[PDB]
């Protein structure tokens, strides 16, 4: 009531952060930023719970204030800054470069990338319109506004964003035979090529998708992120490559390496 | 104070609701402006999210548009002659939207002379070229031009004075003029 909430209890935090239910009543509430607080990862939980570079939030603040970490090339000395999908995170001490991509279990992965790849990111366009004085713009999935885009860029395409400038390098359209990333829903983390999309005028366009082992599935168009053509992706995929082995095959694979 | 909610009314079945909640602020309502004529007096209202709102009380002039002629002039308001919601607003001379008023009409006749060179009712070469070129558009209508002989035009208020502060309008024309004329001349 009476205004915006500022706390976030543990057991209400998103489950993919993997915060243990003991050791505290509260979870780090993500501050307002480029990503929605459910589909986000604060820098405190990334630096402490995923990389183990700190033991406390106090140590995460001590890391942040000497301007070590920067996210998408900007410094961001904020504890609960929402780092989201496709953000690059640079740790100049250790010269490390991460990209936030999902593993197939549905959680954010520690995906180390090279220094050439940290110079860009992909963004899914959410709307194209005309701003004031008739200047067109696009809005990517992390809320970046890019003026004077290519006229061929319609919605649900991916644009390659330069991250030194905010300029657009190239772009991938939306049709059949395109490599997609599922970000959202039950199938979160899977990679498959799009076979066809269902019109459904009035709400919730569906799209059918099959992975490399020929397992089909279907997803709403809200959760699909095109990442290239079949064969080459435009980014480096994490380990596993979005395959979704069943639990039978998973314990068989674990009993191989054990 | 004045509440804007629906929980205080009966249900569609007709039952009396119980008092679920005290009156919240995001459902408030405010007293009316009742904008009179003369000696301009604009108060401010602080509304939701900052977002100032101008209660005009007692407005004097207005910007009125001639739609067939594509112009608009700042004209003085004489008085309200008709209101479809209430006759007491016509009597008390309140200015709301959709009020039929009388306006001064002298800027419109000055523009009509300066634009077309013919006078309504009853020198340089450049002006002669301009006035000759836009000929066969200086024959507006009978009803409006008879008002121009009488120096008072019938206008309709298209703005909301209690909300914006301004009392804007358009000159009545055509079938809408004939409708309100039958309303006015009705005994």
């Amino acid at each position: 009531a009476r205004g915006p909430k500022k706390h976030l209890k543990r057991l209400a935090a998103p489950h993919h952060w993997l915060l243990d239910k003991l050791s505290g009543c509260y979870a780090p509430r993500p501050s307002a930023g480029p990503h929605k607080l459910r589909e986000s990862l604060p820098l405190i939980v990334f630096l402490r719970n995923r990389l183990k570079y700190a033991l406390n939030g106090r140590e995460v603040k001590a890391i942040l204030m000497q301007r070590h970490v920067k996210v998408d090339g900007k410094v961001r000395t904020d504890t609960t800054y929402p780092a989201g999908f496709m953000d690059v995170i640079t740790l100049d001490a250790t010269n490390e470069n991460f990209r936030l991509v999902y593993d197939v279990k549905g959680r954010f992965a520690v995906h180390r990338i090279t220094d050439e790849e940290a110079s860009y990111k992909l963004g899914k366009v959410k709307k194209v319109q005309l701003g004031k004085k008739g200047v067109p713009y696009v809005v990517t999935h992390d809320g970046r506004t890019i003026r004077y885009p290519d006229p061929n860029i319609k919605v649900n395409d991916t644009v390659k964003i330069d991250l030194a400038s905010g300029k657009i390098t190239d772009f991938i359209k939306f049709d059949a035979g395109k490599l997609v990333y599922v970000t959202g829903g039950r199938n979160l983390g899977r990679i498959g090529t799009i076979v066809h999309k269902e019109r459904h005028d009035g709400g919730f366009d569906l799209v059918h998708i099959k992975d490399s082992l020929d397992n089909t599935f279907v997803t709403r168009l809200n959760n699909v992120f095109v990442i290239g053509e079949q064969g080459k992706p435009y980014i480096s995929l994490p380990k596993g490559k979005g395959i979704k082995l069943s639990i039978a095959e998973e314990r068989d694979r674990r009993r191989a390496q054990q | 104070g004045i509440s804007r909610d629906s929980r205080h009314k009966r249900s569609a079945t007709g039952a009396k609701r119980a008092q679920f909640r005290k009156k919240r602020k995001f459902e408030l309502g405010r007293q009316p402006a009742n904008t009179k004529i003369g000696a301009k007096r604009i108060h401010s209202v602080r509304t939701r999210g900052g977002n100032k709102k101008y209660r005009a009380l007692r407005i004097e002039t207005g910007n009125f548009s001639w739609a067939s002629e594509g112009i608009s002039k700042k004209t003085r308001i004489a008085g309200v002659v008709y209101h479809p919601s209430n006759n007491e607003l016509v009597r008390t001379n309140t200015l709301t939207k959709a009020a039929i008023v009388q306006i001064d009409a002298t800027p419109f006749r000055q523009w009509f002379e300066a634009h077309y060179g013919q006078t309504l009712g009853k020198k340089s070469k450049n002006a002669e070229r301009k006035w000759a070129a836009r000929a066969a558009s200086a024959k507006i209508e009978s009803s409006v031009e008879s008002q121009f002989s009488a120096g008072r035009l019938y206008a309709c208020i298209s703005s909301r004075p209690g909300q914006s502060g301004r009392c804007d309008g358009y000159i009545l024309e055509g079938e809408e003029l004939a409708f309100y004329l039958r309303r006015l001349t009705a005994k």
């Binding site: 005028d201 009035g202 | 507006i140 055509g174 409708f179």
Partner: protein
Amino acid sequence: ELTVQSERAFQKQPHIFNNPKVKTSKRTKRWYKNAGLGFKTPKTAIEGSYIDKKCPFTGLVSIRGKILTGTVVSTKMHRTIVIRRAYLHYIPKYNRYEKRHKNVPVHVSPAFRVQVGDIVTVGQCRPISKTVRFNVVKVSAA
């Protein structure tokens, strides 16, 4: 359908201005739109003279949200009817169903003529009145 101009105000579509200077055929500018979702705009809306601010075709409302179907049980309001949606409600203990129903007040345009017993389909709009949130988009029975 005997006069248009019945009220004390002048009934007209907003911002649709007919220029008194010109003289053509096609007597008045009438604004109409297609409501979408495959509903056909009726010819009585396109050619008629009624004003009907809350019309899904000539008026200022938009259809978005649920599309429902009912049977007309009342026409005694003015430009408003009450439809009856009948459904079966399942009770898990006894493993069977029961007949239930709701009454939905919907707005009906003068493009459409309904009587009691007609089946209609309605589209959700913004709140029209205290109870009305739905608007007739196709009458296709008798």
